[PDB]
Design an enzyme around this catalytic site. Structure first.
Site, mmCIF file in Angstrom:
data_model
loop_
_atom_site.group_PDB
_atom_site.id
_atom_site.type_symbol
_atom_site.label_atom_id
_atom_site.label_comp_id
_atom_site.label_asym_id
_atom_site.label_seq_id
_atom_site.Cartn_x
_atom_site.Cartn_y
_atom_site.Cartn_z
ATOM 1 N N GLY A 1 0.649 -0.842 -0.189
ATOM 2 C CA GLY A 1 -0.277 0.251 0.267
ATOM 3 C C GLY A 1 1.253 1.192 0.031
ATOM 4 O O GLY A 1 1.842 1.676 0.130
ATOM 5 N N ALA B 1 1.408 4.243 1.983
ATOM 6 C CA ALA B 1 2.749 3.957 3.167
ATOM 7 C C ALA B 1 3.412 2.882 3.251
ATOM 8 O O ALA B 1 4.644 3.521 3.624
ATOM 9 C CB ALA B 1 1.585 3.639 4.726
ATOM 10 N N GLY C 1 -3.152 -1.476 2.889
ATOM 11 C CA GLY C 1 -2.746 -1.765 4.034
ATOM 12 C C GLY C 1 -2.840 -2.557 5.478
ATOM 13 O O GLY C 1 -2.286 -3.734 5.426
ATOM 14 N N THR D 1 -6.414 9.962 5.988
ATOM 15 C CA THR D 1 -6.946 10.433 4.726
ATOM 16 C C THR D 1 -9.011 9.628 4.772
ATOM 17 O O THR D 1 -9.475 9.811 3.851
ATOM 18 C CB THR D 1 -6.008 9.246 3.467
ATOM 19 O OG1 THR D 1 -6.344 8.379 3.421
ATOM 20 C CG2 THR D 1 -4.387 9.790 3.720
ATOM 21 N N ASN E 1 2.127 8.086 13.476
ATOM 22 C CA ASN E 1 2.156 9.535 12.275
ATOM 23 C C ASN E 1 1.988 10.498 13.714
ATOM 24 O O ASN E 1 2.646 11.462 12.964
ATOM 25 C CB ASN E 1 0.931 8.882 11.883
ATOM 26 C CG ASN E 1 1.375 8.372 10.493
ATOM 27 O OD1 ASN E 1 2.727 8.822 10.226
ATOM 28 N ND2 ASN E 1 0.588 8.418 9.498
ATOM 29 N N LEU F 1 16.777 -12.834 12.214
ATOM 30 C CA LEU F 1 15.030 -11.969 12.812
ATOM 31 C C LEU F 1 14.518 -12.858 13.803
ATOM 32 O O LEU F 1 13.942 -11.848 15.405
ATOM 33 C CB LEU F 1 14.250 -13.022 11.916
ATOM 34 C CG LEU F 1 14.128 -11.907 10.331
ATOM 35 C CD1 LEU F 1 13.238 -11.987 9.809
ATOM 36 C CD2 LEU F 1 14.096 -10.149 11.102
ATOM 37 N N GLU G 1 16.309 -13.558 17.385
ATOM 38 C CA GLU G 1 16.735 -13.061 18.194
ATOM 39 C C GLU G 1 16.000 -11.586 18.668
ATOM 40 O O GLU G 1 16.351 -11.333 19.833
ATOM 41 C CB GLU G 1 18.268 -12.395 17.944
ATOM 42 C CG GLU G 1 18.952 -12.497 18.881
ATOM 43 C CD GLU G 1 20.539 -11.581 19.094
ATOM 44 O OE1 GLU G 1 21.455 -12.661 17.580
ATOM 45 O OE2 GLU G 1 21.252 -11.367 19.594
HETATM 46 N N1 LIG Z 1 4.397 7.717 8.223
HETATM 47 C C1 LIG Z 1 3.149 8.347 6.543
HETATM 48 N N2 LIG Z 1 2.061 7.393 6.790
HETATM 49 C C2 LIG Z 1 1.431 7.672 5.360
HETATM 50 C C3 LIG Z 1 1.885 7.512 4.097
HETATM 51 N N3 LIG Z 1 1.337 6.906 3.240
HETATM 52 C C4 LIG Z 1 0.163 7.060 3.610
HETATM 53 N N4 LIG Z 1 -0.189 7.051 5.528
HETATM 54 C C5 LIG Z 1 -1.466 7.540 6.442
HETATM 55 O O1 LIG Z 1 -1.668 5.199 6.076
HETATM 56 C C6 LIG Z 1 -2.871 6.086 6.157
HETATM 57 C C7 LIG Z 1 -3.955 5.674 4.730
HETATM 58 O O2 LIG Z 1 -3.161 4.424 4.401
HETATM 59 P P1 LIG Z 1 -2.752 3.621 3.145
HETATM 60 O O3 LIG Z 1 -1.197 3.299 2.906
HETATM 61 O O4 LIG Z 1 -2.051 5.678 2.234
HETATM 62 O O5 LIG Z 1 -4.285 3.437 2.038
HETATM 63 P P2 LIG Z 1 -3.324 1.989 1.257
HETATM 64 O O6 LIG Z 1 -2.896 0.555 1.927
HETATM 65 O O7 LIG Z 1 -2.482 2.622 0.250
HETATM 66 O O8 LIG Z 1 -4.505 1.468 1.080
HETATM 67 P P3 LIG Z 1 -5.666 2.402 0.078
HETATM 68 O O9 LIG Z 1 -5.271 3.306 -0.749
HETATM 69 O O10 LIG Z 1 -6.689 2.148 0.498
HETATM 70 O O11 LIG Z 1 -6.490 1.008 -0.907
HETATM 71 C C8 LIG Z 1 -2.992 6.907 6.456
HETATM 72 O O12 LIG Z 1 -2.830 7.321 8.773
HETATM 73 C C9 LIG Z 1 -1.373 8.109 5.941
HETATM 74 O O13 LIG Z 1 -2.516 9.357 6.682
HETATM 75 C C10 LIG Z 1 3.629 7.465 4.876
HETATM 76 O O14 LIG Z 1 4.148 7.841 3.055
HETATM 77 N N5 LIG Z 1 4.229 7.815 5.618
HETATM 78 C C1 LIG Z 2 -10.220 16.687 1.751
HETATM 79 O O1 LIG Z 2 -11.450 16.750 1.890
HETATM 80 C C2 LIG Z 2 -12.038 15.661 0.914
HETATM 81 C C3 LIG Z 2 -12.149 15.069 1.136
HETATM 82 C C4 LIG Z 2 -12.795 13.187 0.410
HETATM 83 C C5 LIG Z 2 -13.890 11.640 0.766
HETATM 84 C C6 LIG Z 2 -14.136 12.574 2.362
HETATM 85 C C7 LIG Z 2 -13.447 12.366 3.360
HETATM 86 C C8 LIG Z 2 -13.260 12.735 4.589
HETATM 87 C C9 LIG Z 2 -12.030 11.770 5.350
HETATM 88 C C10 LIG Z 2 -12.608 11.860 7.162
HETATM 89 C C11 LIG Z 2 -13.309 13.264 6.980
HETATM 90 C C12 LIG Z 2 -13.926 12.913 6.123
HETATM 91 C C13 LIG Z 2 -14.898 13.049 5.448
HETATM 92 N N1 LIG Z 2 -11.782 12.074 3.003
HETATM 93 N N2 LIG Z 2 -11.941 11.861 1.503
HETATM 94 C C14 LIG Z 2 -11.043 11.371 0.339
HETATM 95 N N3 LIG Z 2 -9.533 11.165 0.855
HETATM 96 S S1 LIG Z 2 -11.378 11.020 -0.565
HETATM 97 C C15 LIG Z 2 -13.356 14.107 -0.974
HETATM 98 C C16 LIG Z 2 -13.178 15.236 -1.367
HETATM 99 O O2 LIG Z 2 -13.129 15.607 -2.189
HETATM 100 C C17 LIG Z 2 -13.852 15.060 -3.335
HETATM 101 C C18 LIG Z 2 -12.940 16.099 -0.756
HETATM 102 O O3 LIG Z 2 -12.123 18.016 -1.075
HETATM 103 C C19 LIG Z 2 -13.736 18.004 -1.424
#
Ligand SMILES: Nc1nc2c(ncn2[C@@H]2O[C@H](COP(=O)(O)OP(=O)(O)OP(=O)(O)O)[C@@H](O)[C@H]2O)c(=O)[nH]1
Ligand SMILES: COc1cc([C@@H]2CC(c3ccccc3)=NN2C(N)=S)cc(OC)c1OC
Ligand SMILES: Nc1ncnc2c1ncn2[C@@H]1O[C@H](COP(=O)(O)OP(=O)(O)CP(=O)(O)O)[C@@H](O)[C@H]1O
Ligand SMILES: Nc1nc2c(ncn2[C@@H]2O[C@H](COP(=O)(O)OP(=O)(O)O)[C@@H](O)[C@H]2O)c(=O)[nH]1
Ligand SMILES: [Ca+2]
Ligand SMILES: [Ca+2]
Ligand SMILES: [Ca+2]
Ligand SMILES: [Mg+2]
Ligand SMILES: [Mg+2]
Ligand SMILES: [Mg+2]
Lengths: 352, 425, 54, 438
Positions: free
Chosen positions: D10, D12, D146, D179, D206, D252, D254
């Site tokens: 994923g 991260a 992830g 996100t 984070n 590993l 250890e």
């Molecule tokens: N420290 C760190 N956190 C990350 C990073 N990318 C995403 N995150 C965090 O991971 C969470 C989002 O998960 P992601 O790894 O982006 O999602 P994914 O595994 O790619 O799954 P999908 O894209 O939903 O299919 C959030 O808490 C992010 O802030 C990174 O590059 N570094």
């Molecule tokens: C950051 O503000 C945006 C967010 C998104 C959806 C909504 C979501 C979200 C995350 C936490 C809490 C409440 C909403 N986060 N989202 C995604 N990561 S897709 C969509 C947006 O536009 C299509 C957008 O901007 C207008």
């Protein structure tokens, strides 16, 4: 506009603190389970310290110090005093005490307690002890009565040397304890409230009969309960500091400051500086303050002894208004500023 | 999750749809020719979400134009960007629909819908990963509401695992074309509750009020309303069209905004309110205004309900530390209006490119329970007529039974009960 | 406080300091899980398609 | 020599893998094209660095790494990036559409279609290993990929390589950079399915990395690039002992025997010092005592929590730079007298120390200054259970109203997996409370 939440509704002190906080017009109250608070008036047990300090953009503060129960539950107080170099067994303001668990719970100090109890038998010294749990009190010259009592209950108790020649106010030939209110702020400033209270007993002290409670136990409730002359000499069985000062001046040719308060400030500061590294929130992600109630006995030599520390104390009712205002002055708005202090700051830096 | 298929249906559908393609074509640097002449490459990085690439490096909107009447679509072809649309994607009848939901959903519309679906299939068959569809329409006419919802169920049948998103203009007596509008709207909301994942509720009452009270326009045109609508549409689709720290798509938007499937009717907000402005706006001002009810495009008082979820986008160059600080301040200062049982329900994004005409702007997407106020307003207007069965003949003449009406009213009143359920939970 | 199992080498050294002494599912169970969830998905899709056919 | 395979899942996981492997190459003097002038055994190797890199006849040193994402955009920037040449294309695996922040979509729906492909590429890497130790798996708790795909990968890895050790580097979710609103759901879900398949996991919150970046790097709004370069320094100090000559944590197994007495409580807290701005004009270098002491302030931890109110089961100190045992013992002596460090009764109070003499490497133009010595402490303290309590609370708040669960059920998951996972977490919290409180 700061925000706050109330999770102990049986707190007299923080009930009034809630009220004056609102009366500012700059503090709004939230609902118990709302995480977006600046300030927590937390609950007495299992307060969730692990959830504090994780709200982006919220300086968070709570009215308790995680860890401070080491001081405020009698078995832990005993353990802490005799295990810490800062205090030690030789600590001269604490009664010798030992921790004892019941029969069917079985660590414990039962044998070492009687090690001293016997040279107390032999010694021809007063060998009367009190037994306490953190209702449920026994004062006896016979050890085995003590432990009989202890283990027919299910709690861990502490056996402590009863102070056989207390200071007795006259008229009355009667006992008392002193309660002092201490506020520790987020900076670990230690603030003693200028006003304390003597919780008196209305009954002449009697050395021979150690099983009628009221002439031996000074707390407000037992005097309002089993005592014939509650309210006789002082209102509420409560003598304040102006009076006690005058009485010491008139009858003993001393002042409260010299005879008792130096010792009280010494004990408060030693107790708190001892645990400071374990509970300080100086570089934590949330902050604590806390209000403690220290309870002391004064013997006839005018020596002060610490009997217990209280982690959630109530105030005497005339002082509620003043103290609570100070709590907001010193603990709360120091951290969250609004648009003659009632506290003695306790500090001392002797060089050696 | 890349390509979106856009469909505009009816008079209102096509006029807002065209203004939309004008606005974002400008933002992305494509001219009416379909030729890219921009200066940044943030512009072209995700331009495949909305555009196909043609011979000569032309960009063609992935857009289908639908009406039962030829008028409005020949005006679309006449208009500024008229010749950027692929001509095979104009699909139109001759009858019109007479502001009649039944004509659009059951009689005239049936006749035309298979053609539209042929063009839809042609557009989706060329997609690497199609995320779904956005539809622009009103609910108060006949083609947009009746035929657009017919399309929506046909599309759900052929693409049951794609996302259906709509921009749905709600009718207001303040701007109304006919008396049967509450009927058409209630039938359509019954459809939308069942068959879309995310609906932006664009209320003509709110647009009229903004035009009148805040912009100080005393007789607003549809042009003035649609100015606000194309501002909102450009904002809410920003995080789909541009790359950022947060890159969104239609499904993640549904996942994070919609805690319960039927409660997917969003209240959009925009700041600064503009009309056809030299002082730059400070981040605290954007944040105050965008959350002000006078900036909501759905005529609901957000203090009459609670925010389930919130998503904000700030456009322009500015300090994202200041934006984080400000968003956090509005949450922590009005925390009663955000449900406590969805933690961290406000998410904020920034994009460096601002809309044409502004150095700084903010768009707000709220899933509020205050949206119930809209559906009760419609419901009242509906019952006022339906309790005397007034105007029903226009519909029963096209095959509909009163039963279908009372069913649709019931489903909308349930939707309202659901919202009130969660407003006290 | 005693130091033990000290090891040295050109790039570093390691040791231990003591202050005080003491006082899985099968491949086919997984494919059954994934297949049950796929079935539940297909059934929900069919309930939807049946309602649309109605 | 025994090889380890790193698996990044994923967004991260992939971006952090990028950070780590940039760092590794800097450290072992491997160039972007894959060449290592320093390695005089051309085409082959029995060395400690060969634990993480294989060799080709052209002298190319290739990560024993698999990158896995359900959507291409991020691994695409590996394919076009500065380390384009380093990775064999079969080691970079992408889907078409991601898991939409949905555990059940990544585990069940999209996981099923890609799990066999990923295991096949992983075995292509394992066939090149004379003695595979096992796996380092990098992923976020909060992502849909992830969480969900990693948990399915972990079950299958236990099945195909049951004698191997699996270590995790997990990103724990923080609202300032998260996100999605459902990250608590995902993290509980994945913890519950992954628990008995992981031997030792280093959680990174984070929030903690973000605040370290604001407070000690003077970055107003940290990016993922900032966060990942710091996290990669920490990961590098944790792995240095597999990649370098030494005698502490050399395989590993250890890590488990030194840090994990109880298999369920396998989440060691990592604390790291010092973190110093590269733009700091004048900086006075910190001593062995100062940085070992920094090891015990929460502000330096990968997870904010307070070990004063827990108990230790194990403590390791990994120093890098100009450090000798005498100074370490002196600093430990003095710190023990000034701080609350209570081990559980059935464990020795003590520290395992490892020292490598080259100081930390910092990417040119990064945010971190070069420093003369640094330390990463790994301590298995019950205090880390605070983070679980946080997560669990958030989960309890949403799940009470069943909010969002419909998105998971619609993927084929059954509502019951939510409360199974939550009850496992309840267990976990109780285990920590038993070990660490009186
Ligand atoms: N420290 C760190 N956190 C990350 C990073 N990318 C995403 N995150 C965090 O991971 C969470 C989002 O998960 P992601 O790894 O982006 O999602 P994914 O595994 O790619 O799954 P999908 O894209 O939903 O299919 C959030 O808490 C992010 O802030 C990174 O590059 N570094
Ligand atoms: C950051 O503000 C945006 C967010 C998104 C959806 C909504 C979501 C979200 C995350 C936490 C809490 C409440 C909403 N986060 N989202 C995604 N990561 S897709 C969509 C947006 O536009 C299509 C957008 O901007 C207008
Ligand atoms: N060693 C001792 N010697 C003499 N008297 C003692 C004593 N220990 C306790 N007492 C007496 O017992 C009384 C109450 O005991 P203690 O303070 O331990 O119980 P408690 O916890 O209910 C007081 P509070 O309600 O204020 O917390 C004291 O006021 C004191 O008079
Ligand atoms: N905001 C906006 N609303 C419009 C516009 N045109 C029509 N409407 C509304 O849409 C309703 C009539 O629907 P219309 O699109 O003309 O019907 P159709 O062409 O048969 O689908 C009424 O509520 C009108 O107010 C427009 O250009 N902008
Ligand atoms: Ca016809
Ligand atoms: Ca070699
Ligand atoms: Ca295993
Ligand atoms: Mg019309
Ligand atoms: Mg046909
Ligand atoms: Mg991703």
């Amino acid at each position: 506009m700061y925000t706050f939440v109330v999770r102990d509704e049986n707190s007299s002190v923080y009930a009034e603190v809630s009220r004056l906080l609102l009366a500012t017009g700059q503090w709004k109250r939230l609902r118990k389970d709302n995480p977006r608070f600046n300030l927590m008036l937390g609950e007495r047990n299992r307060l969730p310290f692990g959830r504090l300090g994780h709200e982006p953009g919220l300086v968070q503060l709570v009215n308790y110090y995680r860890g401070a129960d080491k001081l405020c539950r009698k078995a832990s107080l005993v353990k802490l005093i005799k295990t810490s170099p800062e205090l030690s067994e030789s600590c001269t303001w604490f009664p010798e005490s030992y921790v004892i668990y019941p029969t069917n719970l079985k660590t414990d100090e039962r044998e070492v307690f009687l090690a001293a109890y016997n040279r107390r038998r032999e010694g021809r010294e007063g060998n009367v002890w009190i037994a306490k749990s953190s209702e449920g009190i026994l004062i006896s010259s016979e050890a085995s009565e003590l432990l009989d009592f202890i283990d027919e209950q299910g709690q861990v108790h502490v056996i402590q040397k009863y102070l056989e020649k207390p200071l007795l106010l006259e008229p009355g030939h009667r006992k008392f304890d002193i309660r002092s209110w201490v506020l520790v702020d987020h900076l670990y400033n230690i603030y003693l409230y200028r006003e304390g209270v003597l919780r008196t007993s209305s009954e002449p002290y009697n050395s021979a009969n150690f099983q009628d409670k009221t002439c031996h136990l000074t707390n407000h409730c037992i005097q309002k309960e089993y005592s014939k002359n509650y309210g006789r000499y002082e209102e509420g069985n409560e003598m304040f500091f102006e009076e006690f000062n005058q009485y010491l001046m008139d009858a003993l040719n001393t002042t409260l400051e010299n005879s008792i308060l130096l010792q009280i400030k010494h004990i408060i500061r030693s107790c708190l500086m001892c645990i400071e590294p374990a509970i300080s929130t100086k570089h934590l992600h949330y902050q604590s303050f806390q209000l403690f109630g220290f309870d002391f006995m004064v013997d006839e030599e005018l020596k002060v002894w610490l009997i217990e520390v209280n982690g959630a104390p109530a105030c005497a009712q005339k002082l509620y208004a003043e103290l609570c205002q100070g709590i907001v002055d010193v603990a709360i708005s120091s951290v969250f500023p609004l648009a003659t202090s009632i506290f003695i700051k306790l500090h001392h830096h002797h060089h050696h | 999750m890349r390509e979106i298929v856009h469909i505009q249906a009816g008079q209102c559908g096509n006029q807002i749809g065209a203004k939309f393609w004008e606005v974002i074509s400008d933002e992305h640097g494509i001219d009416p020719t379909g030729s890219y002449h921009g200066d940044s490459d943030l512009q072209l990085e995700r331009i495949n979400v909305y555009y196909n690439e043609a011979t000569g490096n032309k960009y063609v909107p992935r857009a289908i134009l639908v009406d039962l009447e030829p008028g409005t679509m020949d005006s679309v072809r006449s208009g500024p960007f008229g010749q950027i649309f692929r001509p095979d994607n104009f699909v139109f009848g001759q009858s019109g629909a007479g502001n009649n939901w039944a004509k659009g959903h059951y009689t005239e519309g049936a006749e035309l819908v298979d053609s539209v679906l042929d063009v839809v299939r042609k557009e989706s068959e060329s997609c690497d990963c199609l995320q779904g569809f956005q539809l622009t329409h009103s609910l108060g006419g006949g083609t947009g509401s009746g035929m657009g919802t017919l399309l929506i169920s046909k599309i759900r049948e052929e693409y049951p695992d794609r996302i259906m998103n709509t921009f749905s203009v709600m009718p207001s007596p303040k701007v109304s074309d006919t008396v049967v509008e509450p009927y058409n709207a209630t039938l359509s909301v019954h459809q939308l509750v069942e068959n879309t994942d995310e609906t932006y509720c664009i209320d003509n009452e709110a647009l009229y009020d903004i035009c009148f009270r805040t912009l100080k326009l005393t007789t607003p045109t549809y042009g003035d309303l649609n100015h606000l609508v194309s501002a909102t549409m450009s904002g809410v689709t920003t995080c789909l069209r541009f790359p950022g720290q947060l890159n969104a798509d239609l499904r993640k938007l549904a996942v994070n905004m919609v805690p319960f499937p039927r409660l997917h009717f969003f209240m959009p907000g925009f700041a600064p309110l503009t009309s056809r402005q030299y002082r730059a706006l400070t981040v605290p001002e954007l944040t105050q205004q965008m959350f002000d009810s006078k900036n909501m495009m759905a005529a609901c008082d957000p203090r009459h309900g609670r925010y389930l979820t919130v998503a904000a986008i700030f456009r322009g160059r500015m300090s994202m530390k200041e934006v984080d600080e400000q968003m956090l301040n509005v949450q922590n200062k009005n925390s009663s209006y955000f449900v406590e049982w969805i933690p961290n329900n406000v998410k904020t994004a920034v994009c460096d490119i601002p809309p044409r005409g502004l150095k700084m702007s903010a768009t707000f997407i709220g899933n509020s329970t205050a949206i119930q106020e809209l559906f009760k307003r419609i419901s009242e207007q509906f019952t006022a007529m339906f309790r005397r069965k007034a105007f029903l003949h226009w519909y029963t003449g096209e095959g509909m039974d009163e039963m279908e009406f009372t069913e649709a009213e019931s489903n909308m009143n349930d939707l309202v009960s659901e919202y009130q359920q969660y407003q006290d939970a | 406080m005693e130091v033990i199992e000290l090891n040295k080498c050109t790039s570093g050294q390691s040791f231990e300091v003591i202050l005080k002494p003491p006082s899985d599912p099968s491949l086919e169970e997984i494919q059954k899980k994934l297949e049950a969830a796929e079935e539940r998905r297909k059934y929900q899709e069919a309930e939807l398609l049946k309602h649309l056919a109605e | 020599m025994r090889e380890c395979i790193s698996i990044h899942v994923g967004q991260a996981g992939v971006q952090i893998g990028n950070a780590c492997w940039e760092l590794y190459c800097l450290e072992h003097g491997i160039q972007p094209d894959g060449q290592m002038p320093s390695d005089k055994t051309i085409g082959g190797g029995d060395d400690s660095f060969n634990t993480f890199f294989s060799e080709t006849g052209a002298g190319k040193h290739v990560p024993r790494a698999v990158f896995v994402d359900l959507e291409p955009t991020v691994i695409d920037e590996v394919r076009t990036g500065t380390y384009r040449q380093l990775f064999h294309p079969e080691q970079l695996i992408t889907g078409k559409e991601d898991a939409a922040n949905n555990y059940a979509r990544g585990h069940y729906t999209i996981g099923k279609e890609i799990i066999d492909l990923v295991l096949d590429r992983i075995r292509k890497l394992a066939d090149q290993c004379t003695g595979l130790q096992g796996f380092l798996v990098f992923h976020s708790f909060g992502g849909g990929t992830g969480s969900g795909f990693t948990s399915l990968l972990m079950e299958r890895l236990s099945v195909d390589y049951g004698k191997k050790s699996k270590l995790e580097f997990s990103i724990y979710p923080a609202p300032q950079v998260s996100t999605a609103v459902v990250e608590p759901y995902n993290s509980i879900l994945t913890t519950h399915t992954t628990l008995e398949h992981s031997d030792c996991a280093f959680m990174v919150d984070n929030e903690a990395i973000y605040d370290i970046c604001r407070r000690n790097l003077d970055i107003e709004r940290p990016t993922y690039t900032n966060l990942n370069r710091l996290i990669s320094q920490i990961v590098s100090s944790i792995t240095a002992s597999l990649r370098f000559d030494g005698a502490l944590n050399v395989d590993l197994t250890e890590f488990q025997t030194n840090l994990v007495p109880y298999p369920r409580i396998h989440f060691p807290l990592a604390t790291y010092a010092p973190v110093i701005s590269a733009e700091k004009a004048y900086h006075e270098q910190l001593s062995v005592a100062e940085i070992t002491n920094a090891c015990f302030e929460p502000a330096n931890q990968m997870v904010k929590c307070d070990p004063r109110h827990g108990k230790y089961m194990a403590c390791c100190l990994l120093y890098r730079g100009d450090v000798v045992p005498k100074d370490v013992n002196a600093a430990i002596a003095t710190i023990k007298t000034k701080r609350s460090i209570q081990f559980v009764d059935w464990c020795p109070t003590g520290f395992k120390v490892g020292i490598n003499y080259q100081p930390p490497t910092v990417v040119p133009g990064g945010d971190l200054a070069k420093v003369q010595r640094a330390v990463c402490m790994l301590s298995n303290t019950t205090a880390i259970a605070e983070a679980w309590a946080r997560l669990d609370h958030k989960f309890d708040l949403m799940y009470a109203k069943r909010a969002f669960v419909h998105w998971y059920v619609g993927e084929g998951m059954e509502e019951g997996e939510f409360s199974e996972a939550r009850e496992d977490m309840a267990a976990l919290e109780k285990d920590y409370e038993e070990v660490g409180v009186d």
